[PDB]
From Swiss-Prot, chain A:
Protein name per the record: Small ribosomal subunit protein eS25A
Chief location of this protein within or outside the cell: cytoplasm
A biological process term (GO) from this entry: cytoplasmic translation
Residue numbers of the full-length protein present here: 36 to 105 of 108
Other comment: It is presumed that the precursor part of S25 is engaged in assembling of the small subunit, thus being essential in ribosome maturation.
Organism: Saccharomyces cerevisiae (strain ATCC 204508 / S288c)
Subcellular location: Cytoplasm
Gene that encodes the chain: RPS25A
Gene Ontology cellular-component terms listed: cytosol; cytosolic small ribosomal subunit
Keyword Ribosomal protein among record annotations: yes
One term of GO molecular function: structural constituent of ribosome
Oligomeric and partner information: Component of the small ribosomal subunit (SSU). Mature yeast ribosomes consist of a small (40S) and a large (60S) subunit. The 40S small subunit contains 1 molecule of ribosomal RNA (18S rRNA) and 33 different proteins (encoded by 57 genes). The large 60S subunit contains 3 rRNA molecules (25S, 5.8S and 5S rRNA) and 46 different proteins (encoded by 81 genes).
Curated annotation (Swiss-Prot), chain E:
Subcellular location: Cytoplasm
Signal peptide positions (record): none
Domain of life where this protein originates: Eukaryota
Function in brief: Component of the ribosome, a large ribonucleoprotein complex responsible for the synthesis of proteins in the cell. The small ribosomal subunit (SSU) binds messenger RNAs (mRNAs) and translates the encoded message by selecting cognate aminoacyl-transfer RNA (tRNA) molecules. The large subunit (LSU) contains the ribosomal catalytic site termed the peptidyl transferase center (PTC), which catalyzes the formation of peptide bonds, thereby polymerizing the amino acids delivered by tRNAs into a polypeptide chain.
Assembly and oligomerization: Component of the small ribosomal subunit (SSU). Mature yeast ribosomes consist of a small (40S) and a large (60S) subunit. The 40S small subunit contains 1 molecule of ribosomal RNA (18S rRNA) and 33 different proteins (encoded by 57 genes). The large 60S subunit contains 3 rRNA molecules (25S, 5.8S and 5S rRNA) and 46 different proteins (encoded by 81 genes).
Recorded coiled-coil stretches: none
Included stretch of the parent chain: 3 to 58 of 240
Organism of provenance: Saccharomyces cerevisiae (strain ATCC 204508 / S288c) (Baker's yeast)
Misc: Present with 146000 molecules/cell in log phase SD medium.
GN (gene name): RPS3
Positions of modified residues (Phosphothreonine): 42
Similarity remark: Belongs to the universal ribosomal protein uS3 family.
Protein name, per record: Small ribosomal subunit protein uS3
From Swiss-Prot, chain H:
Residue numbers of the full-length protein present here: 2 to 63 of 136
Location in the cell: Cytoplasm
Descriptive protein name: Small ribosomal subunit protein eS17B
Protein purpose: Component of the ribosome, a large ribonucleoprotein complex responsible for the synthesis of proteins in the cell. The small ribosomal subunit (SSU) binds messenger RNAs (mRNAs) and translates the encoded message by selecting cognate aminoacyl-transfer RNA (tRNA) molecules. The large subunit (LSU) contains the ribosomal catalytic site termed the peptidyl transferase center (PTC), which catalyzes the formation of peptide bonds, thereby polymerizing the amino acids delivered by tRNAs into a polypeptide chain.
Remaining remarks: Present with 30500 molecules/cell in log phase SD medium. There are 2 genes for eS17 in yeast.
Family the UniProt entry places it in: Belongs to the eukaryotic ribosomal protein eS17 family.
TM regions (residue ranges): none
Subunit-structure text: Component of the small ribosomal subunit (SSU). Mature yeast ribosomes consist of a small (40S) and a large (60S) subunit. The 40S small subunit contains 1 molecule of ribosomal RNA (18S rRNA) and 33 different proteins (encoded by 57 genes). The large 60S subunit contains 3 rRNA molecules (25S, 5.8S and 5S rRNA) and 46 different proteins (encoded by 81 genes).
Tree of life domain: Eukaryota
From Swiss-Prot, chain I:
GO molecular function: RNA binding; structural constituent of ribosome
Keyword Lyase among UniProt keywords: no
UniProt xrefs under PANTHER family: 40S RIBOSOMAL PROTEIN S19
Swiss-Prot/TrEMBL GO biological process terms: ribosomal small subunit assembly; ribosomal small subunit biogenesis; ribosomal subunit export from nucleus; translation
Domain of life: Eukaryota
Assembly with partners or alone: Component of the small ribosomal subunit (SSU). Mature yeast ribosomes consist of a small (40S) and a large (60S) subunit. The 40S small subunit contains 1 molecule of ribosomal RNA (18S rRNA) and 33 different proteins (encoded by 57 genes). The large 60S subunit contains 3 rRNA molecules (25S, 5.8S and 5S rRNA) and 46 different proteins (encoded by 81 genes).
Protein name per the record: Small ribosomal subunit protein eS19A
Keyword field contains Cytoplasm: yes
Gene: RPS19A
The family this protein is said to belong to: Belongs to the eukaryotic ribosomal protein eS19 family.
Length: 70, 53, 56, 141, 56, 63, 201, 62, 143
RNA sequence: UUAAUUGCGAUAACGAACGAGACCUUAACCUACUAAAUAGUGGUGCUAGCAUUUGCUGGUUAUCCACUUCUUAGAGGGACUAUCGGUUUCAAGCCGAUGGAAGUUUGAGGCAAUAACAGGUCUGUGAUGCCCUUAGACGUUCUGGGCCGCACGCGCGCUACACUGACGGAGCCAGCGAGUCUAACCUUGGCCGAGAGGUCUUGGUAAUCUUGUGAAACUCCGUCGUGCUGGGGAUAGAGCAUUGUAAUUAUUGCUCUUCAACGAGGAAUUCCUAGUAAGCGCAAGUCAUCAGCUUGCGUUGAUUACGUCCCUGCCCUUUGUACACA
């Protein structure tokens, strides 16, 4: 494919351990962990926000910023 | 463009004429208009009556 | 030209003008464009007082 | 027989006519509340005349702003100025010059367009250029 | 009528220019210092500012 | 890492091919009465502090 | 604190700005001081403001842009590489983001960390072409001017052909500049201009 | 470039040497003195002339 | 207590009126939908393509409300954007007619828009009622 | 000293003229005058919706009342470096602060000397000397062709090499124009159409209608995720329209498909100091049709000087010269 950007239901399990203990979370960080690429990074952020491991500080389109759950 | 031919630095003339319009609304009878319009004739300032109100 | 142009610049100055200018350009004295400029009094050149008082 | 003053504020071809009247607190722009101005960051430029003095001073008036001309930013700066100039013109006429002074040096302490329009205007375009200064490229050889 | 004033002043402006050049070409020998056009009800009065009128 | 802060007391025209450098007179904030002449690059008003990485060497015009 | 009512209901977060303090709507200019002398009276952190956008008559006479709030000076210097010339609304939105970014990681109130980045990325001795090079000192206004012009150029160059958006790059650059790293087109690019200086100094 | 020319600096000197009384160390009065006494063509020429008569009247009183 | 179309935000209103006009199967779809890009000067069709139309319908409803009377020409030159003419400079080519005409007809049949004198189209009294009802719900849904 | 042969002054010089300045247009200020159904506004009335108490948001160019804040153009007013402090023999001046719409000649132009070029134009001119042709015409008419032809080189441009982005939706605001009668203009509005564009009416000889030219960049929500990729849109293929006696060497527009170079550019070189550069589009000129051009206008709006002769030139004086088409 293109540097580990593949659709998976196991890297769901990889995400939901690796994403917490991040001081900062955004599309840029998710992709720069050689994970899910862009389209999949955004819908990962949206599901992590529904689940409530993420606190959204700002949610502007094109630049969504997030933090670890208190 | 200033020059009659093409040659020379590209200098441009902007000749600007002005036209001023005025707008009077009288409640005159038939008596006055046939004197006021027949008088007050001046060169360079052309006046028209819209006597159908 | 030097007689006719001085004859008319002297008429204009006597008529009651502040100044006059006559410029005669063209092939004067066997084929070479020469500007002979006969003037008396004061002639302004710049600003609107050109448009005000000066006639061309 | 009502306190009512018609003011305007402007920033580069943007005319914002404010109508500050004796009321409760109806501050509205093009028949919509100030809380909905097109640029959502310039929400705090239209608002700052209120946050400068306090909403307590606006607890007994109603303002209606009609904006025409310019662009989005021109129109926000026009509203801001029109509201501040409206409020000081009301306080001058219907309270006293004491409280007018108070909120004039309140408004001009925090730096201003705000009371009097920036003098700046666009310079006309001259030949042999794409603007007032920028000349076309020169071709020696 | 109907012709726009924006255009119609220029139209009778060009009338003056053609008049000035017609008399500047024809009546230039009996003197000439311009024309004037006064627009009246049922009349447009063109007045020649020329010298010796016994020949103009 | 000793960097010496010194306020300017007077500006003295401009040196260099162009007016890129301004010759200035500074007074050392630390252990004052010491007045030294120095070169700057950017625009200098008076009362402005410059950070010297050497308090020693004097300044000459840039012919 | 004193929640007033009007015929136009204003939200309480906006109503907590009236003379309370002027922030962005969260970043305070009480202040964690500039802390480095020579640049005090050259960084404006004394006049608090709501947005990083004034009409501004700051390029009027000479030193007037020293009395412009330093947040606007970043916001201004982010509009370069002229596909973004003008467009201050985009630039202030990027500034809003990068500030709440350098909050969410390494909080420190995201104005004093921006100020500290200006104090650290300022080239403090440079050279002049007099093919010779003569080492001269730097005016504190130019130390700010070039500190901004290194941070904001480094940011766009990092964010160019990348996934890291200008907000996150500028953010990372301001953090590593504040805490002297030499890993942000930063202290590295400044040391390169003080290295050519110490040759002739 | 706020240098006054001879056309104002001569008119001013003629004005003060004639009306030294009826000239009072104030532009706003000297402006209206020039309106009444002189036949100056432009409004802006008056303001420059009157502004320099005032400058001369302040200097003559030291 | 006097919430109108103007008292509520632009997008946050149109999105709730989009939900409402989709729940109701009352407003028509011209049938050529899925094969149009609502312009002469665009690249690709509307990305949603699940009847956007319910967003046009909503916005033409909200626009005709705020204005006095709107014609199809005003909607075309409104919705039309900058056309990339290839290597030539960008222009203004106005949006597609049929989409804006057939959505006005769809509002006319539903009873939102009324064929108005002076030409163009005004709002119906039923139109103002339905718009203001949604406009009140939108705000109190958050509150 | 000055933007300045602008001035203070010193003085075989004294007294003058031109140019600079002045002047004029223009862009900003005018809770002041003078008026506005071709500009608005606040009121009543006929009312629409949400509320229910009064209150909000609208409609009504032929329902009346009132004024002039906005807008328009008249006569004017205001700024003269005004006041204060510095500062030069305390002279012209200059610098700083304050007030003010405005403190650079207030911003920008127009006008613009003497002398000069063998600068361009005889293809703008019933401007013109001479020379050439004068009908098998070198006159102007008709048909078609060419000014567009392509190994290659150069100059102004436009589009881009993307994530500060593209695309889709929604949000949604200017300013200067121009526009038809015995003609075909600007063209609302409703229908047909995926288009482009057609139809049947309509307002405007125009602050009345086009037109608020609800322009684009821009804003927000979402779809693309570092790949010549959906960046880029060149070349080509086929079709549908419009203008035009005529579209082939494809006028232009529109639909689908074809997808090239281009990963920010070597030696060089251009323009620019504030509402300026730059981005963005808009209107006008030619115009039947054709703008990647120009003339103007606003929209968004920086960085960096506030300096100096280093380069390239300028102005004045001194000086050397074998130069004077210098």
């Amino acid at each position: 494919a293109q540097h580990a950007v593949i659709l998976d239901q196991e890297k769901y399990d990889r995400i939901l351990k690796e994403v917490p203990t991040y001081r900062y979370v955004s599309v840029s960080v998710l992709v720069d962990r050689l994970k899910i690429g862009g389209s999949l990074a955004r819908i990962a952020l949206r599901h992590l926000e529904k689940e409530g491991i993420i606190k959204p500080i700002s949610k502007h389109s094109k630049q969504a910023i997030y933090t670890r759950a208190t | 463009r200033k020059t009659p031919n093409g040659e020379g630095s590209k200098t441009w003339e902007t000749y600007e004429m002005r036209i001023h319009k005025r707008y009077i609304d009288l409640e005159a009878p038939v008596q006055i208009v046939k004197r006021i319009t027949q008088i007050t004739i001046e060169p360079g300032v052309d006046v028209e009556v819209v006597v159908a109100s | 030209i030097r007689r006719a142009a001085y004859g008319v610049v002297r008429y204009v100055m006597e008529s009651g003008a502040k100044g006059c200018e006559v410029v005669v350009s063209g092939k004067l004295r066997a084929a070479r464009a020469k500007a002979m400029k006969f003037a008396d009094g004061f002639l302004i050149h710049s600003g609107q007082p050109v448009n005000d008082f000066i006639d061309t | 027989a009502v306190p009512s003053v018609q003011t305007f504020g402007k920033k580069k071809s943007a005319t914002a006519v404010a109508h500050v009247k004796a009321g409760k607190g109806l501050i509205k722009v093009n028949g919509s509340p100030i809380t909905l101005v097109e640029p959502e960051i310039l929400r705090f430029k239209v608002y700052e005349p209120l946050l400068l003095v306090g909403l307590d001073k606006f607890s007994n008036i109603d303002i209606r702003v009609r904006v025409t001309g310019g662009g989005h930013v021109s129109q926000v700066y026009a509203i801001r100025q029109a509201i501040a100039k409206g409020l000081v013109a009301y306080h001058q006429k219907y309270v006293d010059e004491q409280s007018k002074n108070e909120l004039k040096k309140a408004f001009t302490s925090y730096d201003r367009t705000l009371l009097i329009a920036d003098s700046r205007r666009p310079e006309p375009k001259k030949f042999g250029g794409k603007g007032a200064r920028s000349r076309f490229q020169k071709s020696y050889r | 009528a109907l012709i726009s004033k924006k255009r119609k002043l220029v139209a009778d402006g060009v009338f003056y220019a053609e008049l000035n050049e017609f008399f500047t070409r024809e009546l230039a020998e009996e003197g000439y210092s311009g024309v004037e056009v006064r627009v009246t009800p049922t009349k447009t009065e063109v007045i020649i500012r020329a010298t010796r009128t016994q020949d103009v | 890492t000793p960097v010496t802060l010194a306020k300017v007391i007077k500006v003295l025209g401009r040196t260099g091919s162009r007016g890129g450098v301004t010759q200035v007179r500074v007074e050392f904030l630390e252990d004052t009465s010491r007045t030294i002449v120095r070169n700057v690059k950017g625009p200098v008003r008076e009362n402005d502090i410059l950070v010297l990485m050497e308090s020693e060497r004097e300044a000459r015009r840039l012919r | 604190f004193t929640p007033v009512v009007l015929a136009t209901p204003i939200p309480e977060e906006v109503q907590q700005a009236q003379t309370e303090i002027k922030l962005f709507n969260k970043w305070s200019f009480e202040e964690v001081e500039v802390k480095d002398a020579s640049l005090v009276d050259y960084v404006q952190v004394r006049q608090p403001i709501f947005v990083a956008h004034t009409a501004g008559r700051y390029a009027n006479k000479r030193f007037r842009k020293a009395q412009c709030p330093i947040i606007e000076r970043l916001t201004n210097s982010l509009m370069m590489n002229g596909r973004n010339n003008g467009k201050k609304l985009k630039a202030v939105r990027i500034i809003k983001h990068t500030l709440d970014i350098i909050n969410v990681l390494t909080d420190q109130n995201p104005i004093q960390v921006v100020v500290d980045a200006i104090t650290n990325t300022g080239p403090r001795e440079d050279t002049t072409r007099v093919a010779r090079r003569q080492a001269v000192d730097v005016s504190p206004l130019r130390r700010v001017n070039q500190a901004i012009a290194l941070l904001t150029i480094g940011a766009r160059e990092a964010a160019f052909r990348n996934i890291k958006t200008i907000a996150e790059t500028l953010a990372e650059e301001l953090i590593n500049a504040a805490k002297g790293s030499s890993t942000s087109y930063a202290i590295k690019k400044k040391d390169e201009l003080e290295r050519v200086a110490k040759s002739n100094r | 470039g706020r240098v006054r020319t001879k056309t104002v600096k001569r008119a001013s000197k003629a004005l003060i040497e004639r009306y030294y009384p009826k000239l009072t160390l104030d532009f706003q009065t000297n402006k209206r003195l020039c309106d009444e006494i002189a036949t100056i063509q432009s409004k802006r020429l008056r303001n420059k002339i009157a502004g320099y008569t005032t400058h001369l009247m302040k200097r003559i009183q030291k | 207590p006097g919430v109108s179309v103007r008292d509520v935000a632009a997008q946050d209103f149109i999105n709730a009126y989009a939900s409402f006009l989709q729940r109701q199967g009352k407003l028509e779809v011209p049938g050529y939908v899925d094969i149009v890009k609502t312009s002469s000067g665009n690249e690709m069709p509307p990305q949603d393509a699940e009847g956007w139309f319910y967003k046009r319908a909503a916005s033409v409803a909200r626009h005709i409300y705020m204005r006095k009377q709107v014609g199809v020409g005003k909607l075309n030159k409104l919705y039309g954007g900058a056309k990339s003419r290839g290597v030539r400079p960008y222009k203004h080519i106005d949006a597609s007619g049929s989409i804006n005409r057939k959505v006005l007809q769809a509002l006319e049949k539903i009873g939102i828009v009324e064929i108005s004198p002076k030409g163009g189209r005004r709002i119906s009294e039923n139109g103002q009622r339905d718009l203001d009802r949604i406009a009140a719900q939108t705000l109190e849904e958050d509150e």
